[PDB]
């Protein structure tokens with residue numbers, strides 16, 4: 001249907017690459033003698049000239065940018081990020097893809113108000129993967145993400161660097177953060193506030209930029225795709241502009257949780273909200289051509305319900321040089337890793353139905369705000385469970401995210417007989433798309449940390465109103481590892497704290513090297529991640 005946003009100068013602005021976030025300093029962990037990397041992120045309003053000929057757009061971003069700066073953390077290095085709220089609404093930061101303790105996981109009620117900050121202590125122990133950090137504050141997640149509270153967090157591993165995949169952040173390893181937004185006639189954003197169904201958006205962005213281009217060399221590039229949209233799911237394919245409908249083959253090498261066992265040869269990538277897929281596209285056969293990254297219409301080929309507009313088929317353009325500057329010395333190995341799948345289980349799966357109760361998106365008839373009923377599962381830490389995730393609906397689709405766990409997609413059924421499990425779903429994931437009338441069974445190890453965690457639809461409109469519930473990964477009174485201060489996400493030790501803007505800007509008081517050092521050393525003494533010591 002007709003684009004509502006003003007006409008954009010398509011494929012005229014280069015793909016921006018979020019800058020790498022650098023730690024401010026490192027603190028000696030007194031427990032193990034190891035350096036914890038300490039970062040400061042200031043959440044703050046800013047404007048961006050999205051449309052060259054109109055007004056600017058009001059955004060609120062990590063370090064006053066959108067997307068947020070890209071973290072780059074080696075496995076084994078613990079991180080503390082101080083997220084400082086200097087904006088006009090509360091925040092709760094979730095590191096999506098991280099087995100963070102309950103009080104470091106962005107629990108929706110665990111907010112930071114303006115004039116407060118929270119210290120988030122991250123383990124960085126899991127398999128190399130593309131994580132992303134984004135807002136999760138109760139009822140306002142859609143608008144905080146949409147206005148720019150989302151960024152990339154790359155967990156790296158020398159074992160994976162040895163695979164010799166296309167490499168170099170912003171070189172041949174390119175972040176591809178997809179969003180879908182709507183603008184006013186004056187080039188500001190149309191708010192998601194009030195929207196209770198879905199906010200599709202009609203303007204497709206990569207890394208915060210409508211319909212960009214990038215100059216590429218005729219060689220292999222690694223693309224880290226993230227659907228950071230409020231409501232839009234994609235069916236991604238690449239086509240030569242001389243044959244705009246002919247899908248060019250590529251390889252999927254990674255899902256949410258990291259590398260697949262083997263690359264998946266693919267010409268169409270289904271990607272819904274919060275899913276990450278890492279692609280190697282080989283431009284060597286298309287020297288001198290323009291390749292368009294495109295998006296499947298008819299509501300993602302009948303899998304979705306998303307509205308399609310005049311330009312939502314277009315994502316961006318790659319302009320392929322005649323030659324390389326230097327040889328492509330990268331490969332895509334047939335054997336990427338042994339995926340650490342859970343031990344299969346025969347116990348009857350739990351059932352979760354993603355539907356609506358009046359005007360509210362619900363799980364098993366419950367809204368997250370109904371505290372009394374929203375705890376839908378107690379799972380003893382160490383258990384492997386199958387959950388059957390049911391979308392009986394034809395009029396909505398639900399990408400389901402389970403916090404804490406990596407899971408295996410066991411099965412999909414479709415009441416429109418559309419598809420079963422996809423080859424790029426072969427590995428470990430933390431989000432799975434329930435298309436129209438789809439039921440998916442996932443299997444997960446509920447390990448290794450006890451605590452109360454969320455699971456929900458990652459359609460942020462659905463999430464906010466109010467398609468989200470909790471599970472408790474439980475332990476016995478004798479388990480140890482300081483579980484009594486780490487199971488409740490609202491534990492007062494880990495709560496946000498007020499600050500004065502003067503002390504932040506002068507890096508004095510609570511922001512002095514001495515206060516930061518004392519705070520982190522105190523947090524580290526409780527040993528949040530010791531139970532995953534192997």
Ligand SMILES: *[C@@H]1O[C@H](CO)[C@@H](O[C@@H]2O[C@H](CO)[C@@H](O[C@@H]3O[C@H](CO)[C@@H](O)[C@H](O[C@H]4O[C@H](CO)[C@@H](O)[C@H](O)[C@@H]4O)[C@@H]3O)[C@H](O)[C@H]2NC(C)=O)[C@H](O)[C@H]1NC(C)=O
Nearest residue numbers: 375450451452472473474475476477479482483484485487
């Ligand atoms: C999510 O699951 C966690 C477990 O992983 C769970 O935390 C556990 O809560 C229970 C009950 O509150 C705790 O056991 C308590 O220990 C304290 C302190 O010594 C006592 O106050 C309690 O004693 C009363 O109740 C006993 C048991 O019925 C009676 O025998 C006694 O007479 C007392 O009246 C009680 O034993 C346990 O310590 C925690 N475990 C941890 C590791 O924190 C949590 O409650 C669950 N969360 C939610 C939101 O459901």
Ligand SMILES: NC(=O)c1ccc[n+]([C@@H]2O[C@H](COP(=O)([O-])OP(=O)(O)OC[C@H]3O[C@@H](n4cnc5c(N)ncnc54)[C@H](O)[C@@H]3O)[C@@H](O)[C@H]2O)c1
Nearest residue numbers: 196197198305356358359391392393394395396397415437
């Ligand atoms: N167990 C039960 O309660 C029960 C009994 C009989 C039938 N059903 C099932 O109900 C389903 C209804 O048939 P359908 O596939 O035509 O509809 P559906 O499942 O897509 O929609 C169910 C209801 O929600 C409404 N709806 C759809 N999309 C919506 C959206 N985005 N926002 C708000 N409301 C929306 C529909 O108009 C309808 O009134 C069938 O699959 C049928 O098998 C359930």
Ligand SMILES: *[C@@H]1O[C@H](CO)[C@@H](O[C@@H]2O[C@H](CO)[C@@H](O)[C@H](O)[C@H]2NC(C)=O)[C@H](O)[C@H]1NC(C)=O
Nearest residue numbers: 031480481482485522523524525526527528530
């Ligand atoms: C649980 O957390 C407490 C509090 O940080 C730890 O107790 C501290 O332990 C360190 C090193 O053993 C001491 O120097 C501190 O003086 C302790 N503080 C208190 C209040 O006791 C304890 O080690 C942690 N337990 C586990 C199993 O991690």
Ligand SMILES: [Cu+2]
Nearest residue numbers: 094096134274
């Ligand atoms: Cu998320």
Ligand SMILES: [Cu+2]
Nearest residue numbers: 096097401403
């Ligand atoms: Cu998450």
Ligand SMILES: [Cu+2]
Nearest residue numbers: 398457459462
């Ligand atoms: Cu949903």
Ligand SMILES: [Cu+2]
Nearest residue numbers: 094136401454
């Ligand atoms: Cu979440």
